[PDB]
């Protein structure tokens, strides 16, 4: 006879974006209507001293 | 896999199946034994020292 000795899968493995470092660079926003947005602005204002 | 963004092709689901085998591999030693041995082991006689 000929013997098979276990046809076990490929063992799986995860990983998450926030669960890594580099979220730190990030802020992490969820936002459900991203679609109606064209884009984003940050107005300042500073007067030199 | 992993995502990709737009304007850009992307991977595919791929089955991977591989298959290995075991190996033969006898050893052999000869040992031996003279008749007066096997004479001397079974038969006593006279029963001197």
């Known amino acids: ?49 | 896999r992993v995502a990709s963004g737009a304007g850009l092709p992307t991977s595919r689901q791929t089955t991977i199946m591989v298959t290995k085998y075991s190996e033969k591999s006898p050893i052999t030693i000869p040992f031996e034994l003279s008749a007066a041995c096997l004479t001397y082991l079974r038969e006593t006689f006279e029963g001197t020292i």
Request: glycine share 6%.
């Open chain 1, 1 to 49: 006879f000929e013997a098979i000795f276990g046809t076990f899968c490929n063992r799986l493995e995860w990983v998450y974006f926030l669960t890594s470092g580099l979220a730190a660079a990030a802020h992490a926003i969820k936002f459900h209507d991203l679609n109606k947005l064209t884009t984003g602005k940050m107005l300042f204002h500073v007067q030199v001293p």
